[model samples]
Target: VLHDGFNFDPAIPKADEPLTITFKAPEGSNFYGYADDLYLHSGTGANWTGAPTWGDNQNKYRLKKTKDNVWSITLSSSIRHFYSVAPSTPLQTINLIVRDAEGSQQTYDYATLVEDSQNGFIWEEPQKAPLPISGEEKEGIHIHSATSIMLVLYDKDSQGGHKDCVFVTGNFNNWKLDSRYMMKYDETNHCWWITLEELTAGETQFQYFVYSASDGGTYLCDPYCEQALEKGVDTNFPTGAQAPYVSVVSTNPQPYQWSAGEFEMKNKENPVIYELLLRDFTSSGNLAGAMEKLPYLKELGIDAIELMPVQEFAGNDSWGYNTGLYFALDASYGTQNEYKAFIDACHQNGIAVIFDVVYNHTNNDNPFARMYWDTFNNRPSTKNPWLNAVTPHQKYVFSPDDFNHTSEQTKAFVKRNLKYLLDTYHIDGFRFDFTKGFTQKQTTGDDDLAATDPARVSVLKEYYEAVKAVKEDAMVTMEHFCANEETTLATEGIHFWRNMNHSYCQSAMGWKDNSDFSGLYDTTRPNQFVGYMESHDEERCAYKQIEYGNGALKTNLSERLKQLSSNAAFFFTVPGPKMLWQFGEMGYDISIDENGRTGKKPVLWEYQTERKSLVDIYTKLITLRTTHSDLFNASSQFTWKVSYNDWDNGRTLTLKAVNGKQLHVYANFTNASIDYTIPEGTWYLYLEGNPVEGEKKISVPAHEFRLYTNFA
Candidate 1:
C-alpha cells in the first residue's frame, strides 16, 4: 500500500546506517520519457525546517545511473558522511526530485521532503507491476540488466492472506521454479520482488508462481505483461515444456524506428472508416500481409481504419474479445515492430489508425483475474481489487468476470494502459466495445439491457476525457448497444455506431422487415453517427443475398452481386461518418459462422475479381464521401428518408449546400419500381454521363441506384 516510487537497501534508511536509494521511473512518470541521465537534487530539512536550497539544488546530489530507467545513490559509509546534515540543525526530512541535466522532465512526485528521523526508512518500489528491467548488473546482484529483468507483485492478501513466498518460472529459467529466483518480500508495501538473470536475446515466457500459508500456490502472469502465451492452443511454445500459460519477456528488445514523421489526423471531421480484421484479410493475414493492402485501402478512399482488437487474446485465432494482456500485441498477428511498421505505413498512406479495444471484461487467465481467484467458485474472488467477482447486469456477462471500473486500482491501471498504448503505437482513436458493461449495475427485468445506464455512461465519459486529454484530436467511438444513452454521449463529441446491418440486410434479402436506418442516424449533430451497413459482428450482405435473398435476387449470382452494389450506393449517400466490413468492398459472401463463431474463416482475395461491380460501387461512392467530406458534417441541410414502407420500395437522400448546388441519391431496394419524382433542373448523373432536364417522373428499374446532382 506504500511503495512510493523508490526502493532503498538494508530494508530502510538511517542517518548513521549506510543507505542506498533506487529510483524506478513509473508508468505515468514525467521523467520516464527522458530519464537516460538523472541526478538527484536532495538535501535535509531541520528545526524551523528551512530546507529551501535542498528542494531545487543542482548536481550536488547526483545519483548514479543504474538501468535503462533506473538510478541509485549508494553510500559506503553513512547518511551522515554523505549529507553532513549537521548544517541543517535538527534533521527532519530529506527533500529530493530526480532530474536530467537539462531538467526538461523529471519525476515530479519524487520531489517530496523526507519525513522525521528514521532508522531504515524503506522506499518501496511503488508501481505494483513488472518492469522490463534494463542496465548492466554491478557485482551480479541488482534490480536490472541487459541480460536480466526484475519482476514484482503486490499481493495484499491476494493469496487469501499475506503471501509467504513468490517465484517466477518460464523458458528464461527452463520452466523450473528455481530457488535462486525465489522473490523476497517487502514488509512496507506487502510486495514480493525478484531479479531473473539467465535471460537471452529471444522470447522468454514466464509466470509468477506465488505461495502463501493458506493458498498453497497460485500461478499468474504479471497483469501488466505485454505478451502472454496460452496453455493448450498456443501450446507449441519453442524450447519449453507444454505449460498452460506464461508472461513473455521481449528478448533482444529493439525500439521501433519510426520513419514516418508526425502524423496529424485531419480526417476526424467526417471519417470514412474501413473496419479491418487482420485475421481474415489476406493469405497470411499477418501484419506483413496488411502492409501489402495499404495502397488498396488508400485507393478505397477511407481516411480512418479501425483495426479490430490486436491485443493479446486467450487463443491465437480468437476475435480478441477474450483478451488477457491489454498492453501486449498478439504474437499471432505480428511482432511489435511489425505492428508499428504497419501503423507507420498507414500514416504515410494518409490514413489514421483506430484501435478496437475490449475493456468490459477479460479472460480468466489474466493476471489481474488469477492473482485473486476463487478456486472453488471459478470466478475472481471478492479479494480481487481490480475486478468484480459478479456484476449486477447479468443479462450480458462477458467472460464471466467483469471489471470493477469503480476501483482505484482498476482506474489507474486503465489510465496507465491508455498512456502506454498511445505513447507506444500512436493509434489515433479507439472503438470501445461493449461499454454498456462499464458499470457494475445489474437488473433482472426484461428491459435490463436497454434501460438508461448512467453509471456506465459516467465511467465511459471519464475514459473519453482521459483519451482526449492525452490527444485532443483522438476520436472516441462507442459500441454501447443500449438505450438512448448513446444520444446523450454522442451529444458530448463522442461518435457512436449506428449499425444498420439488420435493416439494410433485411431490405437486401427482399424482405423489408424493420428496415429503417434514418430513424437511428437523423440526429441534428454533425459527424456523430458512424453509419455502417455491415460490420464484422454481422452476417455478410452478399452471403444473405444468395442464401436467402428475396425472389429474383436469391440464387442469382449476378443479381446478388448487383444488389450489394445497390446497398453500397444507398449506404455512402447517407449523411454521416461511414464504416464497412473488411471484405464488404468486394462483396465477401463467406459466412461468419463457416468455422466456429470465434474461429478463423476463409480469406478470399479472388472476390475482388469475381465481384468487380461491388468494388466499383464502393470506390465510386467512397471517393465522393471522402473528397466532399465537409458536406456530411451537418444534417440540417441534409434530406433523407430510409427504407420506409413496402409500397415505396426505395429510399431517397439529398444534400443541398448554401451555394444552390444539390446532390441527390435514390435507390430501389426492391425488384420493381414506379415513376419517381425528380427535381426541376438540369441534372447530371454520376457513374453514367447522362444529362436530363425537367421536374418529371422517371422510370426506374429493379435494384438500380443513380447519383444525380444539379451541377456535376
Candidate 2:
C-alpha cells in the first residue's frame, strides 16, 4: 500500500506546533522514478498551478526525498502560525502530486494516505484561534475617513453552522487571504468585524470566506453591499460561477450633490401617476437615458412617477419582482449615483419618485435564502430567521422564498432596509408588491385566503408604522385587493392599488355587457385607492379596444383613438388618485405578453410623434384632473346621471360637483349615430375648448365621445 511506510514525528499535531510528515514510495512504483518531480500542495489558496518547484524556497514549502524511497517535510511553528492567526486560510487537507518523465502527473488525496498509513500517519485537530482584541461591530462597509475602512458581516443564528471563523479577501491584497484581515466575532451583536487602516481613496472588491467544522467552508458576498459587480460580465469569474456576487468597496466614495431645491410633494388625493419601467422606457435602458425625458413627462402633466422595482435582482433583465438584494440598487440599470441623480432630476421637474418594492418574496440567489437553505427540501429551513420554512399558500405565491413577516427578526430586517432607502436614496415612498402574503395564516385549500386576513392587516399596519416613523410624508402603497372593509381600514394613511382594468378595457372595447364602471366610485375612503385602467400586470387597453371593439370601430383608427381618450376622461373624472401604464397615453397597441409576460419590450418613442392626437388628449385629461382637484373629492357634494341601459349602443355620464363644476361625457358605442340629452347649462366643450348652450339633444357620431365641462 502507498502508506505502509508513511509516518509523522508527532502522534497528534496541533496547528501551532511543528511536525514532520513522511511518505515512502511503494516497490516498483512510478513515484520512485519521478521522485524529483514530486511536490506537496496544501491550504485554500493552493490552486494546483502554483505548487512549489522541487527545491528549497522560503516562500514555497518543498519536500525532500531521503533514503528508502521516503519523502519528508517538516512544518515549523511560524508556518503553522500563519494558519492559526486566522481561519480565513484554507488548510484542512494536503495532497501530493507526482509528475512522470513523460510530463504526465498524478495527484493523491489525504484520504488515500490516511488509509495507506495503517496506523503510521496521524493528524490532530487544529486548536481554536482566539477572537481578535480590536475592531468595532457594525453592518456594511463604513468609511470613517479617507484612511479608515471598517467591514462588518452579521451572521445572526449562524444558520449554516459555518460561523466559527471568517476572513475577508479583496483586490487590495491581490484577492489572497491574509491572517490580519480576519474578523473578530462580537458575542453581544452576533457579528464579525474588522477595520483596515491607512488605506488610500479608491475602489476594491471583496468577499467573506466562512469556515466551520460542520460545513467546512463557503464564500458569500456582503448582504448589505451598496454596490457590486456582476460575475462573468464584470470580473474574471467563470460564467455560471457559484457565488457570483462580489462587493465593490470605495475608500473615498463620493455622495451625489442634488440640484433639486426644496421639493414639495404633490397632494396625495389627486396625483396623476405615470408608471414606467426604466428598462423598457428608453433604448439605453438606464437611469441616465430616463433622465433625458423628464421634461416630456413634466409636460405630460404627470405629478408622480412610479418606477418598477430597481432593487438588485438575479440578472440584468428582469421585472425586479425576484429581488436578490433589497438595499442595493441594480447595477445593470446604472450606478447608485446615477439613480440618485435621476430622482433629483424628477424632483426638480415637480415629479415625485415612488419605488416599487418587492417584500413578500425573494429569489433563490438571495443571500438570506442561501444562508438558511434546506438542500433536501429546496427551500428555507426551519432555522431560517428571515424566510418561511415552507412555501406559502398558492394564492400568495410569487417568488422562490416568501418572507415570514411574523418573525420579529424578519420585521426588523425589512424595517431597516426601508429606512436605509429613505435615508440614502431620498426616495418619496414605496409601492409594496404582493401585500396579500404578509401573514402567517395557512390556507392550503382555501381559494380566497387573500380576501381578508386579520393577521395580514396587522402585519401591514406594523410595517406602515415603521415606514411612517422614518418619514412621515413617505407615500406608502400596496398592491392589495383584499376585502374592501379590511383594505379600507388598513389603508388609513396608505394607498391601495384598485385594479379596474377589466371593466375599463371592456368598456373601451364596446363590450358593455360585463363593463361595470362602479368600481371607480366603490371606495368610501377618499385618496385611499389608486385606480388604474391599465398597469404592468394587465393587458394594454389599446390592444384590447382594437381586438374586440364593436364591428367597424375596430378597423377605424380615429374611432379607436377616441375610445382610448374616452376611457381616460371617465377614469380621471372619478374622485381619487390615478395611474397609467407607460405608452397608454399614446395608445400603444402592443400586448403585455408580446415577447413574454415579463420580458423586455420595444421602446416606441415614435408613438409620441405618430400618435400626437392621442397623446394630446391624455395631456388635456391630466391637466383637467389635477387642475380641478375639488371635483375629484369623495367628500365633496356630487351627483351623477349615468345611462348604461343600451350599454353596447351608447352611454352617457354626467357628474356635477358642488364647486359649480359639471362634466357631461358622452360616448356612441354603436355602429351608427345616437342622440343623448344635453343638460341645461352653459357648458364648455373640453376637447375643443369652446362654449356650447345646453337644453338640447345632440347626435354623437359612431364610436365618438364628447367631454363638456362647466368649470370655465
Which residue pairs in model 1 clash with each other?
Answer: 3-126, 12-120, 13-120, 13-121, 93-114, 206-247, 226-328, 231-244, 392-442, 393-442
For model 1, what is the error of residue 587's alpha carbon versus the real structure, in angstroms, after optimal superposition?
1.9
- Tens-digit lDDT track of model 1 for 194-216: 77776777766777766542333
Query: How many clashes does each candidate structure show, in the order listed?
Result: 10, 1
The TM-score of predicted model 1 comes to 0.76
lDDT of 1 at 662: 74
Local distance difference test, per candidate? 0.70, 0.70
Which tens-of-lDDT digit does each residue in 408-455 have in candidate 2? 767877888889998888888889997877877777644466557777
After superposition, the stretches of candidate 2 with alpha carbons farther than 4 Å from their true spots are 1-137, 158-162, 235-242, 445-448, 484-491, 638-649
Cα deviation of 15 in candidate 2 (Å)?
A: 13
The positional error of residue 83 in candidate 2, measured at the CA in angstroms, is 22
Candidate 2 TM-score, true structure as reference: 0.80
State model 1's lDDT.
0.70
